[PDB]
């Protein structure tokens, strides 16, 4: 009977939807364990980068006085099925929307999502093929484009995903103030008692030549970008493995 | 005419949401077009809004019933379709009467949320 076989055909498709998804689970459990090496070798490159940029400032004064453009650089995955990472990032970006907001998102999904949603603030996006390892050159490409998008920018902010554990992927923010505001704060941390922890670091930079300081600023900015993309990839693979479990259970319930 | 146009628009929205629901269950709600996410959110609010506490079920519902005049049914749904209530929480439409009841419930939910946020912040 056709009606009975209609269900059989429907279940026939479900039975193989599982196999293809099961193979995808295996694919994404190789890359998760391949990128688990970072877990060991992270949390030490960015030590003096903290001193350069770690400033626990208020979330209102830093955006209310947007005299110049604020360049957001959210990190998004090329392929879907990751989970709620992209959705949360969009919520995090929607919560900061300003007159002086310029967007340079990363990843195909980021471009497509941010092109449609905010169409007069998006400028263009960066896309990387997940073929090689996330290297310094890619980070330098992100920064150079960010400057050309808005050279007279109050701040360049990177919104990415931090992989705390296999099941915990929080949202993290690296905020990089432009040269003029950074050197001004670096000048105050040196002379004044305020910002004690940065006093020695700041005076050790003011002693050197300016070009070295500019190179120092760019170099550490690149490292922060490199850490964000590296973490966002590890969170991506970890999240996909979890999501590709949820699909299995949904396809099992059916 | 306004009654007819609103009703057809509601039916079209719910029809599309049903079709999208097939994709949602299998893959997930986050594998959809950004346009289809807006439709889903509006459709879910419509589904919640269609519910109503009856005056004859004050025992099974535990809440006072409502009588909604047709002129408020048309206006409330027409506004919802336009999207003027997108900021309102989804649950605000659940088990309520007219749009005014939705707003009052949203206000109470916001007050409770603000209280919880204040308690969390004060914990610092």
């Amino acid at each position: 009977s056709g009606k009975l076989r209609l269900y059989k055909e429907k279940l026939e498709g479900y039975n193989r939807f599982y196999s293809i998804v099961k193979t995808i689970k295996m694919v994404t459990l190789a890359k998760y364990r391949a990128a688990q090496g970072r877990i060991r070798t992270r949390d030490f490159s960015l030590r003096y980068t903290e001193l350069a940029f770690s400033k626990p400032q208020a979330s209102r004064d830093a955006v209310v006085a947007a005299k110049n453009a604020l360049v957001y650089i959210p990190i998004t995955t090329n392929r879907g099925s990751c989970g709620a990472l992209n959705s949360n990032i969009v919520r995090c970006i929607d919560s900061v929307v300003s007159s002086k907001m310029v967007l340079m998102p990363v990843g195909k999904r980021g471009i497509d999502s941010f092109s449609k949603l905010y169409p007069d603030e998006f400028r263009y996006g960066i896309i990387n093929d997940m073929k090689e390892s996330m290297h310094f050159g890619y980070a330098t490409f992100v920064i150079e484009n960010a400057y050309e998008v808005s050279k007279d920018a109050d701040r360049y902010q990177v919104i990415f995903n931090r992989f705390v554990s296999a099941g915990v992927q929080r949202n993290a923010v690296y905020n990089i103030p432009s040269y003029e505001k950074w050197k001004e704060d670096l000048a105050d941390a040196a002379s004044s008692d305020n910002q004690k922890n940065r006093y020695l670091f700041a005076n050790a930079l003011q002693n050197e030549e300016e070009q070295l300081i500019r190179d120092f600023f760019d170099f550490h900015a690149a490292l922060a970008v490199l850490n964000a993309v590296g973490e966002n990839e590890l969170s991506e693979q970890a999240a996909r493995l979890v999501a590709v479990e949820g699909q299995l259970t949904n396809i099992s319930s059916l | 005419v306004d009654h007819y146009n609103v009703a057809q628009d509601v039916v079209q929205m719910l029809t599309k949401y049903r079709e999208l629901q097939d994709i949602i269950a299998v893959l997930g709600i986050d594998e959809l077009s950004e346009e289809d996410k807006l439709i889903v959110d509006r459709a879910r609010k419509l589904v919640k809004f269609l519910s109503q506490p009856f005056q004859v079920a004050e025992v099974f519902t535990g809440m006072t019933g409502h009588y909604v005049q047709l002129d408020d049914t048309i206006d409330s749904f027409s506004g919802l379709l336009m999207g003027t209530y997108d900021q309102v929480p989804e649950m605000a439409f659940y088990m309520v009467g007219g749009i005014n009841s939705v707003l009052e419930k949203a206000k109470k939910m916001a007050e409770e949320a603000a209280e919880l946020e204040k308690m969390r912040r004060a914990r610092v």
């Binding site: 209102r60 919560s95 | 900021q87 749009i99 707003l103 949203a106 206000k107 949320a113 603000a114 946020e117």
Partner: peptide, 30 residues
């Protein structure tokens, strides 16, 4: 300018909507 020379239920909905939006914005701030 020449228009200047010669020349409530819905308000309640607008008032309530504004209050709810204000509360949802206030909670975000702090």
């Amino acid at each position: 300018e020449a228009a200047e020379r010669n020349p409530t239920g819905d308000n309640a909905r607008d008032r309530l909507l504004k209050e709810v939006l204000a509360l949802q914005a206030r909670i975000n701030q702090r």
